[PDB]
Design a protein around this ligand. Structure first.
Ligand code: HEM
Length: 267
């Protein structure tokens, strides 16, 4: 009965896994375009994109409650939605396990399925221990931690690269590798010099980013890749964007999948 909109794919994932989607107290009525999992989230109508929201886009679905990533914005749109008397409950994006725990627990609370939350949390904590043990047992590539560059270019308009304090940086480290980009936070444009300075062994990119530019050959013919080990060896790994970067209940499997795929590419 209370109308809910979720902003941030991980939060929608959590909401659905928890059976919080269609209950007598809370109905999920919309989401942003990062909400692609599970299939029920695909079906929700969309308000826009997490980081380029319009207040009207959100408000046209008449929400009573918004569950929102701390990275949702711009800030004026979030503030306009609160100013419209809508409750907005915000979740941190600290890119660690505590962040996912707070999503599981916080979404359970906001949606009033606390018990399903405790069961998912417990199951998550055990999967996570299994993921960490599997990574600790083998450095991907068999030698030193490989240098991994993350390319962010979801729509193909502008290739960006990941520095520190990003989901990508955290995922790279969790998977037993090192971020080839060092010395700045967040994202900056991909340039020939940024590639040469980073000298990656592997290029990581989302499935969607890779397909937006036309595939592996288009990516590697980008000027500057030829001077990098990853470019000479044509080493490109891709995962679904939400799965890789979302910091949701599938974090353990994402970390293990990224670990496995880095190893395959390096052997
Ligand atoms: C100028 C355009 C865009 C910029 C600059 C951009 C920027 C970003 C950044 C900074 C992140 C977080 C990455 C990290 O922490 O490592 C991200 C995550 C993501 N973005 Fe975008 N983005 C753009 C467009 C899009 C569009 C159009 C979509 C989908 C239609 C998309 C889907 C995603 C997804 C699924 C994630 C990860 C999960 C999430 O954030 O909820 N982005 N984006």
């Amino acid at each position: 009965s209370k109308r809910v909109i979720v902003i941030g794919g991980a939060l929608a994932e959590t909401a659905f896994a928890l059976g919080g989607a269609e209950t007598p107290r809370y109905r999920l009525v919309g989401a942003d375009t990062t909400c692609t999992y599970p299939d029920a989230a695909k079906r929700l109508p969309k308000v826009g994109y997490q980081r380029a929201l319009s207040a009207e886009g959100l408000l046209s679905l008449r929400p009573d409650l918004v569950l929102a990533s701390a990275e949702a914005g711009p800030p004026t749109a979030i503030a306009q939605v609160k100013g419209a008397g809508v409750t907005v409950t915000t979740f941190d994006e600290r890119h660690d396990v505590e962040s996912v725990r707070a999503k599981i627990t916080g979404v359970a609370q906001a949606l009033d399925v606390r018990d399903a939350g405790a069961a998912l949390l417990q199951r998550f904590d055990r999967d996570w221990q299994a993921a960490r043990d599997a990574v600790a047992a083998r450095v991907p590539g068999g030698a030193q931690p490989p240098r991994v560059l993350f390319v962010l270019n979801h729509t193909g308009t502008q290739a960006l690269v990941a520095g520190q304090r990003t989901a990508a940086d955290a995922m790279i480290r969790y998977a037993g590798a090192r971020n080839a980009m060092q010395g700045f936070d967040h994202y900056k444009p991909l340039t020939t010099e940024a590639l040469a300075a980073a000298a990656p062994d592997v290029v990581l990119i989302s499935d969607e980013g890779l397909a937006a530019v036309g595939g592996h050959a288009a990516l590697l013919a980008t000027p500057g890749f030829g001077a990098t080990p990853a470019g000479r060896a044509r080493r490109v790994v891709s995962l679904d964007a939400l799965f890789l970067l979302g910091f949701g209940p599938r974090l353990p499997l994402a970390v293990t999948t990224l670990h496995r795929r880095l190893s395959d590419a390096l052997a």
